[PDB]
Amino acid sequence: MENFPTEYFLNTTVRLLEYIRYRDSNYTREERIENLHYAYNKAAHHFAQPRQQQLLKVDPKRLQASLQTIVGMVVYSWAKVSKECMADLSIHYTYTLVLEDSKDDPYPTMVNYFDDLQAGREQAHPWWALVNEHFPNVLRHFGPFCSLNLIRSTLDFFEGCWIEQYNFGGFPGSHDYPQFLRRMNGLGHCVGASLWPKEQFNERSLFLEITSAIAQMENWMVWVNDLMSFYKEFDDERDQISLVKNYVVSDEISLHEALEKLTQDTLHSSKQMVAVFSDKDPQVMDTIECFMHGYVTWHLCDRRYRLSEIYEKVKEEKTEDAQKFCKFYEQAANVGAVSPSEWAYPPVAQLANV
Amino acid sequence: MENFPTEYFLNTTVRLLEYIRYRDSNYTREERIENLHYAYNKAAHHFAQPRQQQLLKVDPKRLQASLQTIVGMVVYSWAKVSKECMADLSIHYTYTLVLEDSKDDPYPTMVNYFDDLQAGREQAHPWWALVNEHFPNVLRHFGPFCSLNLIRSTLDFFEGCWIEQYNFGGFPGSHDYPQFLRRMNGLGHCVGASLWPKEQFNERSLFLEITSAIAQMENWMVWVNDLMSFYKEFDDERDQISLVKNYVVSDEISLHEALEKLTQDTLHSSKQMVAVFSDKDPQVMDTIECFMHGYVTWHLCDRRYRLSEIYEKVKEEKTEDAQKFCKFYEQAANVGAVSPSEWAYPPVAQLANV
Ligand SMILES: CC(C)=CCC[N@H+](C)[C@H]1CC=C(C)CC1
Ligand SMILES: CC(C)=CCC[N@H+](C)[C@H]1CC=C(C)CC1
Ligand SMILES: [Mg+2]
Ligand SMILES: [Mg+2]
Ligand SMILES: [Mg+2]
Ligand SMILES: [Mg+2]
Incomplete structure (x- = not known):
């Protein structure tokens, strides 16, 4: 391509939204805010701890921005889990997001991975040290089966980030590479299984449905992002190994x-x-x-995806799609558009500095 | 029907061995046998240990048959790894095969999985206790990246067997379920990464190719089995939740x-x-x-897949399939057809009983 397939994007989006039944919820802005601040506050206090501040090497500003992007995604999507749940999930998913930052080679720190794990010795890689130490607060909200899923998917993610460091879109003709990688770093089963706290559900009672949920949510969740994220990633010459971009390189299309x-x-x-x-x-x-609805709301609302930019372009356009989109957008806006100043405070740096 | 597409079966298989370039190797029967017995002997002595004999609840006959089926698969496919490597891989893959047996619910034994892991306390589930204890002998032949892959895939497998116990072929319309499950219990990355011992390869030097290999081998390996296994698997009352069978149930085809x-x-x-x-x-x-070639050889040779039966019903036909099928089947049974008496001895039970 050359320019952004604006309309095509619009069509597909609108269609996606209809298929899932994107309609209003009884999840008020007062409620969203209540939760945002709760989750954010617990997490902030966590990442502000000296040990965390030390072992997790991240630019303060990015940790801040990432923490906020995560809390938002969680609160808006795990709408039914408890406040503590959203909080703890926020802390975990913020860890995973931050790891995408380390440019550092995992090899040397992963050399004794299995021996230290089996021995009970803290991992060499600082991330694993913090993450595995914190994990119990996440796992306490779930049953054994779901926990296993969260554990695996996170391990999967670590490898994904490793493979990612090589900035490799796959050898042409390596058709199985793309999705292999996307699933590897998508946290599919982590998301999927984290939707069923043992306080509101019963793994054994809904094993079949939960298992099926994980199986299906995994692809929906990653593809919807790859889709809605396609606009921000279009011209970003820095982001070179995305699912779509790899399809091109690997499938030669x-x-x-x-x-x-x-x-x-x-x-x-x-x-x-x-x-x-x-x-x-x-x-x-x-x-x-x-x-699903919350996931789409958050994408439309977080500035991270710059979707507000395509809103302006087709805002006054009088076509069907352009309109169906703007309606949907405006919809989300009324419940999801919230000034960080209303929940994200004080900044992590501040709690840390004390 | 309730019959068996014997024709499509032969055709597909040929196309398969053709595509892969199924030709003769410099891996002589003397060599195959030398390795078979080496691997078998080390494993047999292992599974005959009192601790193993206790914790691993398996019918002696099945452990025996399984151990032999595994040693064969390994020796015939990891043709380039060292003898010790084949041995240790045989011990690991025999553990995984045996697990398909336990009908016991994992739930209660998986309740403190993460806490015991992080603490370094032996797992509650006896399988994990034996497997994780042994793992180092497998992992010593690999580098950190490949090891991670073996570790993950095995964890994946455990979940797979868990999901398997529910004998569930997926909700109709749950199109993503089948492959989700197949990969979950296929040991794809375990196989794929286990092909590159650090003694003959360099993970860092061939990271891209190794990663690509894992990505591609995963699907080839499982599908080739689902295919060649389409025999002994159909006329069954047990594993009625195979990939193909689930496609039917889930995709409603x-x-x-x-x-x-x-x-x-x-x-x-x-x-x-x-x-x-x-x-x-x-x-x-x-x-x-x-x-690839070894994998096909072993399928054609192991009794487990009863491919000898389709040989007879075609050992005398004209079609460029039933004939171009035995042309291989022959070759297979030439370097691959080996009486167990030549390598698999004494029986595990015997070493154990002493
Ligand atoms: C970057 C975010 C928050 C969402 C996009 C979806 N991704 C496929 C995953 C990236 C890492 C995490 C934490 C969650 C899901
Ligand atoms: C079942 C066998 C031995 C070979 C065919 C391929 N499998 C599907 C894989 C999963 C289960 C194991 C133990 C090994 C590999
Ligand atoms: Mg994306
Ligand atoms: Mg990205
Ligand atoms: Mg099979
Ligand atoms: Mg099986």
């Missing part, structure tokens, strides 16, 4: 053909997602529907 | 449509497998080609 591959999967996933869970345990479909 | 899907993926995988690695480091393509 046009950036458009690749974008098409994505949209198709995204939609199909959405459809089947609804098809499967609609007539299932109401409490399930609920958590599932809330996550 | 005919057993034939499902079978064609597999064969399409299997071939394509094969095609690209060759396309990608041919012009790559010769030593790589070599390990890769040997694994």
